[PDB]
């Protein structure tokens, strides 16, 4: 019972191809493929679901052999008009009955050819593929097997053939015209036993409503009530008593095939074949049986022969009642009935219906309601988007790439008939908005950066066509920015950097990499190094598998966890590419490059190399090292302190202190290992520097810490 994981993947990868097909515009048949998946799953309750798919296939016009499948949501306007006496409310109910009976007729017709192909020697068939040939043969087998009728009752024969069954089983198999043409081609015979009959069925097959004239219908009701309905038992051909109830819709209250060897699938075919949709603008004298009168019936079958919960049903026969409710168009109550028993299929079934516009979504405002919820007009609704939400929380961590595919399907109700074109699309966009904030998986979701780095397109913008204009850039940046605003304010610089770069605000990225670098150098010597929480990688396999990359293919695989290495990389790309370089403003780009040496300096002192470090500081040109001790040039160097950037200026106190330590240690190191006259002038110059910087910090009494000077002298 752990194929649920196995199955969700099979179903998931199909959503990937499903969504891919809507995107470009390639043809694709969702119910066809979902049914195939469910049939090759081995589910105990499988068949009933495979069948219900085939019903809505016929019900809608999803025919793969014809290549004709409806455009997205072809039925939305037609279904979701609340006015219950409208041209669209009626036109729906009618095609619900047409395609529902069409399948029940096809279902039997498939049961027939199968039975025939079982006895090629006992079902005598000519080379002719006549529809009446196969029914005749089917009727022959049904007697050879002794399953046509209980033996005792009397039938009516012509040429030995039982004519009434040849008509009945023609009506059952969806052939109405061919039954009438059989009555006409044999009018000589039919006139003998029932002359009135040929007039009715000819009126039947001629009307597209499969309904009779008023003289016919009243003449048929009478013919049926008088000498059949209350006549001697067993004397009337049960196929004629049946052919009458079909043709005339007689005894519309008692809809049972009493005389025949019939199964539930026949019982079903009748309850659908007898129903016709009247115009709401009339009083149905006789109480013409319609889709609602049928829907009410099925709703009573469940409370009688079926249970409510997953504990009450242990036989596993919930499949039938779901299939029953699908035929009746009660999609809103069926999917809710099924969700406990197979919460997997209840979704994927709810997916395929919404692609066509049959599932009534809950209006966006009240997303909080439970699964099943009723409208302000007592019309059922399902919380389609939220249903996916809960279903998402089983695989959203290991594979958000799949979760996004499922989550865009909130967009299906972006059609205007749902009442929200922007309103439902907003809840989808809102749903993705809080998905990205939940996970740090910014490398797959929103995108990644090359070494150039042109954006490696992220999934949410690969699936941008579904959400937005098709250019799909207005919403993409909007979620990228706000996500960054919550990474920089949570100090997740590695994230905030990645995001702010994608939104093409490269200057802000520089402000962060520098800030993290200013704090990296501002540390004391030998202290625990600064280390930052790296980014969520893109592709992940620890052992034995390398995918589309090696470490360093992109930053997502770089393992950057040190602000020195981060600032080095960004500035690497930014500097050697002139298109990025020119978008980063002067103070921030230089201020960064300063700290890039400063850290290189702090690492020279951590090492303890004095002469090299002092050349770095000399090249920075921040301090008056080359002053040679004339207060003139030193006063000029101190005047240029304001122009320094914040992330540098704060680390000057450390810089000044480091600079002396190199002048003092190389002065002491000169005393021993080193001619001597030139070593004395250096020794004096190095002592002049420590006295020059002494004055530098002194002029800036206001802009530098109070105790820098006194601690400066102590060590000079």
């Amino acid at each position: 019972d752990r194929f649920l994981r196995e199955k969700q993947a099979k179903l998931a990868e199909k959503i990937r191809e499903f969504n891919d097909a809507r995107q470009r515009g390639t043809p694709f048949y969702i119910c066809r493929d979902l049914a195939d998946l469910e049939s090759k799953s081995g589910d105990r309750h499988g068949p009933h679901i495979v069948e219900a798919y085939r019903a809505v296939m016929e019900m809608v016009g999803e025919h793969p052999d014809a290549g004709e499948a409806p455009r997205e949501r072809q039925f939305a306007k037609m279904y979701l008009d609340p006015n219950t006496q409208s041209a669209n409310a009626l036109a729906m109910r009618k095609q619900i009955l047409k395609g529902a009976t069409t399948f029940l007729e096809k279902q039997f017709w498939n049961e027939v050819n199968s039975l025939i192909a079982k006895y090629p020697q006992d079902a005598n068939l000519g080379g002719l593929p006549d529809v009446v040939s196969k029914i005749k043969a089917y009727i022959r087998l049904r007697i050879a097997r002794k399953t046509l009728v209980p033996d005792n009752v009397e039938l009516q024969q012509i040429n030995g053939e039982y004519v009434w069954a040849i008509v009945f089983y023609l009506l059952r198999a969806g052939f109405v015209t061919e039954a009438a043409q059989y009555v006409n081609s044999n009018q000589a015979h039919f006139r003998a036993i029932d002359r009135t009959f040929s007039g009715y069925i000819n009126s039947y097959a001629s009307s597209e409503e499969r309904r009779l004239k008023r003289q016919m219908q009243d003449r048929c009701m009478s013919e049926y009530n008088q000498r059949i309905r209350n006549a001697p038992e067993g004397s009337i051909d049960p196929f004629r008593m049946a052919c009458y109830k079909i043709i005339g819709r007689c005894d519309l209250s008692n809809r049972s095939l009493d005389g025949l060897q019939t199964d539930v699938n026949d019982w079903i075919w009748l309850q659908f074949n007898l129903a016709r949709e009247t115009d709401r603008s009339l009083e149905l004298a006789g109480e013409s049986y319609g889709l609602a009168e049928l829907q009410a019936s099925i709703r009573e079958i469940g409370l009688k022969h079926f249970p409510k919960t997953a504990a009450e049903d242990t036989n596993g026969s919930f499949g039938m009642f779901f299939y029953l409710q699908i035929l009746a168009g009660m999609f809103e109550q069926a999917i809710a009935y099924l969700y406990p028993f197979s919460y997997v299929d209840a979704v994927h079934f709810a997916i395929a219906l919404t692609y066509y516009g049959l599932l009534r979504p809950v209006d966006a405002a009240s997303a909080g309601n439970e699964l099943l919820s009723h409208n302000t007009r007592s019309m059922p609704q399902i919380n389609f988007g939220r249903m996916l939400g809960y279903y998402t929380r089983d695989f959203r961590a290991a594979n958000p790439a799949a979760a996004v595919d499922y989550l865009v399907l909130i967009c299906l109700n972006a059609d205007e008939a749902a009442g929200g074109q922007q309103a439902q699309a907003a809840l989808c966009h809102e749903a993705l908005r809080e998905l990205v904030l939940e996970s740090r998986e910014f490398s797959r979701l929103i995108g990644d950066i090359r070494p150039d780095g042109r954006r490696i397109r992220g999934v949410i913008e690969e699936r941008g066509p579904l959400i937005a204009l098709g250019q799909e850039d207005d919403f993409i940046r909007t979620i990228t920015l706000q996500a960054a605003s919550f990474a920089d304010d949570n100090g997740r610089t590695t994230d905030a950097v990645l995001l702010y770069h994608l939104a093409e605000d490269y200057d802000t990225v520089v402000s962060i990499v520098s800030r993290a670098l200013s704090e990296a150098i501002s540390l004391e010597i030998g202290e625990d190094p600064m280390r930052l929480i790296p980014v969520k990688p893109r592709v992940t396999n620890a052992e034995g598998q390398v995918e589309e990359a090696a470490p360093g293919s992109s930053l997502s695989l770089a393992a950057i966890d040190d602000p020195v290495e981060l600032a080095k990389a960004m500035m690497g790309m930014y500097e050697r590419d002139h298109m990025f370089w020119q978008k980063i403003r002067e103070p921030n780009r230089v201020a960064c490059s300063v700290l890039l040496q400063m850290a290189d300096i702090k690492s020279l002192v951590e090492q303890g190399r004095w002469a090299e470090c002092l050349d770095k500081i000399r090249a920075l040109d921040i301090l008056p090292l080359t002053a040679r001790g004339d207060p003139g040039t030193i006063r000029s160097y101190a005047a240029r302190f304001p122009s320094l950037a914040q992330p540098v200026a704060i680390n000057v106190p450390n810089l000044l202190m480091w600079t002396v330590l190199c002048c003092m240690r190389q002065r002491e190191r000169l005393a021993g290992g080193q001619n001597e006259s030139t070593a004395r002038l250096m020794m004096d110059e190095l002592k002049q520097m420590t006295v020059d910087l002494m004055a530098y910090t002194s002029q800036l009494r206001y802009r530098l810490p109070p105790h820098l000077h006194e601690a400066l002298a102590r060590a000079s």
Side-chain angles (χ1 to χ4, degrees):
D1 285 344
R2 206 66 107 194
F3 303 70
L4 303 171
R5 327 183 335 232
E6 165 84 271
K7 195 168 132 208
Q8 277 156 330
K10 299 175 176 180
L11 293 147
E13 196 80 300
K14 184 57 52 166
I15 306 287
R16 184 183 177 175
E17 321 180 20
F18 179 32
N19 280 317
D20 273 323
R22 326 164 45 177
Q23 190 165 347
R24 52 211 56 155
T26 299
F28 184 79
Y29 316 100
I30 183 62
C31 299
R32 183 273 308 270
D33 288 281
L34 282 172
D36 289 22
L37 295 171
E38 182 55 29
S39 56
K40 290 282 147 109
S41 64
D43 287 28
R44 285 224 169 286
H45 64 297
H48 298 109
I49 295 169
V50 194
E51 214 67 6
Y53 274 140
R54 310 234 182 268
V56 186
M57 283 190 69
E58 186 76 42
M59 215 182 275
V60 165
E62 183 188 322
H63 295 298
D65 300 339
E68 195 79 23
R71 55 191 142 286
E72 287 192 11
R73 296 196 78 74
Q74 179 175 319
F75 304 87
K77 172 201 165 183
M78 206 183 305
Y79 195 104
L80 300 170
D81 166 33
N83 186 31
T84 191
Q85 300 92 358
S86 57
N88 311 268
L90 176 66
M92 177 68 63
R93 295 191 300 271
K94 271 172 164 284
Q95 190 173 0
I96 293 173
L97 293 174
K98 167 172 177 304
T101 312
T102 300
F103 176 76
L104 297 162
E105 292 165 350
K106 298 251 184 61
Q107 188 171 357
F108 175 81
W109 189 237
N110 297 17
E111 299 164 6
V112 166
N113 296 4
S114 304
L115 171 60
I116 279 191
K118 182 177 185 186
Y119 302 116
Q121 299 298 321
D122 309 87
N124 307 47
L125 293 174
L128 237 90
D130 183 17
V131 303
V132 194
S133 284
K134 277 140 76 180
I135 299 291
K136 277 178 179 185
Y138 169 86
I139 296 161
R140 307 203 255 258
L141 303 186
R142 256 306 252 288
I143 299 174
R145 300 179 60 187
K146 299 170 58 178
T147 54
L148 183 66
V149 296
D151 170 31
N152 294 338
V153 169
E154 173 60 35
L155 312 189
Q156 245 159 115
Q157 66 173 26
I158 294 169
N159 300 330
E161 302 182 338
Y162 300 93
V163 290
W164 290 114
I166 295 165
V167 173
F168 172 62
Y169 288 137
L170 261 173
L171 297 174
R172 175 77 171 80
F175 299 97
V176 172
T177 273
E178 297 80 6
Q181 187 174 353
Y182 168 81
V183 173
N184 301 322
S185 196
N186 289 30
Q187 184 180 348
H189 302 274
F190 278 100
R191 188 166 59 229
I193 57 171
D194 203 337
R195 177 175 71 83
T196 41
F197 188 98
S198 181
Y200 311 114
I201 194 181
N202 280 266
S203 173
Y204 202 98
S206 52
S207 50
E208 273 294 349
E209 297 78 1
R210 282 164 185 187
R211 187 175 175 181
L212 290 184
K213 332 288 188 174
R214 291 221 200 207
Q215 297 303 321
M216 298 289 108
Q217 216 296 128
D218 223 324
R219 179 181 183 80
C220 181
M221 208 84 112
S222 50
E223 180 70 11
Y224 176 83
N225 303 311
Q226 291 177 338
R227 302 177 178 180
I228 302 180
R229 190 173 172 273
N230 285 65
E233 178 182 3
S235 61
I236 309 302
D237 196 22
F239 290 89
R240 180 171 96 123
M241 179 183 292
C243 272
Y244 260 68
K245 195 176 297 181
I246 301 172
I247 292 289
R249 301 185 55 189
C250 310
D251 199 349
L252 217 50
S253 51
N254 188 102
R255 307 181 296 275
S256 314
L257 289 180
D258 286 346
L260 320 179
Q261 294 296 148
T262 41
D263 53 47
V264 56
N265 276 276
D266 298 324
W267 197 96
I268 289 165
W269 170 84
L270 184 67
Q271 312 277 341
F272 273 78
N273 183 263
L274 296 175
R276 317 276 202 291
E277 270 307 328
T278 66
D279 192 333
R280 282 288 225 160
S281 70
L282 195 64
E283 271 157 328
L284 294 53
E287 220 178 327
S288 198
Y289 185 68
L291 178 63
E293 291 82 349
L294 166 59
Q295 282 170 353
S297 188
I298 300 169
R299 215 160 44 210
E300 227 68 57
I301 310 176
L303 310 190
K304 286 178 186 179
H305 312 269
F306 284 128
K308 288 292 296 189
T309 75
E312 295 179 7
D313 198 316
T314 63
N315 295 342
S317 294
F318 64 88
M320 177 64 67
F321 193 61
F322 167 66
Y323 166 82
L324 298 174
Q325 289 169 118
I326 288 304
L327 290 176
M330 341 174 73
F331 313 98
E332 294 87 35
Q333 193 99 226
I335 297 166
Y337 169 90
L338 176 59
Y339 190 100
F341 301 94
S342 178
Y343 90 131
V344 182
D345 284 288
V347 188
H348 305 97
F349 214 100
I351 286 171
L353 297 177
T354 306
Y355 180 87
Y356 294 126
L358 302 171
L359 181 65
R360 172 165 37 243
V362 296
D363 38 29
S366 60
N369 296 338
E370 297 173 352
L371 184 64
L372 177 63
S373 56
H374 276 97
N375 197 43
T376 68
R377 298 177 180 270
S378 293
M379 304 309 305
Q381 315 164 108
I382 292 181
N383 205 333
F384 178 43
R386 298 291 302 280
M387 185 220 290
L388 295 179
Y390 287 50
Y391 174 84
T392 304
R393 305 171 177 178
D394 190 29
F395 57 104
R396 81 197 315 193
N399 190 324
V404 172
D405 287 326
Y406 281 69
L407 287 167
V408 180
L409 307 182
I410 300 165
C411 187
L412 292 185
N413 300 280
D415 170 271
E416 300 82 283
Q421 192 174 3
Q422 182 185 355
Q424 290 274 333
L427 183 59
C428 163
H429 301 2
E430 180 69 8
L432 282 179
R433 181 178 178 174
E434 13 182 20
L435 177 71
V436 176
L437 294 166
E438 183 178 357
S439 68
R440 294 186 54 253
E441 293 282 356
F442 297 106
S443 308
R444 314 208 246 220
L445 294 171
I446 297 175
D448 185 18
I449 313 185
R450 279 291 199 109
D452 189 315
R454 305 142 291 140
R455 186 205 285 252
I456 296 176
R457 294 208 70 93
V459 176
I460 297 185
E461 68 167 25
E462 286 173 357
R463 291 287 131 82
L466 287 55
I467 54 163
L469 187 158
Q471 295 172 337
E472 37 87 30
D473 274 336
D474 179 30
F475 173 59
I476 303 301
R477 175 164 304 214
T478 307
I479 73 99
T480 301
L481 297 175
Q482 66 190 242
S485 172
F486 299 170
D488 188 35
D489 302 342
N490 284 315
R492 296 205 293 287
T493 75
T494 2
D495 293 347
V497 161
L498 170 67
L499 297 173
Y500 271 112
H501 184 311
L502 294 174
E504 303 177 19
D505 185 22
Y506 313 92
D507 163 76
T508 303
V509 176
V510 152
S511 304
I512 287 179
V513 300
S514 291
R515 182 184 312 186
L517 195 43
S518 159
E519 297 174 29
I521 303 168
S522 187
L523 296 171
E524 295 178 353
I525 48 174
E527 200 94 327
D528 283 333
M530 180 171 300
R531 296 177 183 174
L532 302 178
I533 298 172
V535 285
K536 281 295 195 71
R538 251 170 57 239
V539 312
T540 58
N541 221 156
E543 293 179 342
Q545 225 175 315
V546 306
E547 283 186 350
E548 304 165 345
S553 181
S554 64
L555 189 143
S556 311
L557 303 171
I560 292 170
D561 72 330
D562 192 271
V564 184
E565 219 55 70
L566 163 53
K568 219 180 220 136
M570 300 296 99
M571 295 300 296
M573 301 174 188
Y574 284 151
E575 197 175 5
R576 71 182 68 93
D577 195 352
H578 187 281
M579 67 172 288
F580 294 92
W581 197 234
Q582 65 182 2
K583 308 181 180 172
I584 329 182
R585 56 176 184 184
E586 194 82 344
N588 257 4
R589 60 162 97 175
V590 184
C592 186
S593 184
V594 179
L595 299 171
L596 294 180
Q597 333 195 38
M598 293 198 61
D600 210 84
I601 291 169
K602 173 168 180 175
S603 60
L604 288 173
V605 174
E606 248 181 339
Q607 287 173 232
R609 295 184 179 179
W610 313 128
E612 299 204 84
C613 175
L614 183 60
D615 295 321
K616 272 270 123 60
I617 300 147
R618 224 181 304 238
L620 295 180
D621 193 33
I622 309 170
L623 301 174
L625 295 182
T626 181
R628 268 267 260 291
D630 61 329
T633 64
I634 297 175
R635 173 166 298 128
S636 174
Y637 266 93
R640 300 185 292 170
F641 192 68
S643 63
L644 298 176
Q646 161 52 35
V648 176
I650 189 162
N651 288 339
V652 173
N654 317 97
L655 176 67
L656 294 167
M657 181 65 63
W658 294 328
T659 302
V660 178
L661 208 64
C662 297
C663 280
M664 288 296 93
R665 293 285 179 102
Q666 189 177 3
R667 182 180 180 267
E668 291 182 336
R669 172 162 302 174
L670 273 164
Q674 314 173 349
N675 185 349
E676 174 279 331
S677 79
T678 22
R680 170 180 62 85
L681 245 143
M682 293 181 195
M683 207 150 163
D684 278 19
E685 289 171 324
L686 305 220
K687 183 51 162 166
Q688 203 57 221
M689 291 175 174
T690 178
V691 169
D692 303 349
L693 306 168
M694 190 83 61
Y696 186 76
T697 175
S698 185
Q699 301 188 44
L700 301 170
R701 322 163 218 68
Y702 312 118
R703 291 185 181 280
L704 284 193
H707 302 141
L708 184 63
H709 205 217
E710 187 223 326
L712 224 302
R714 140 177 255 181
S716 66

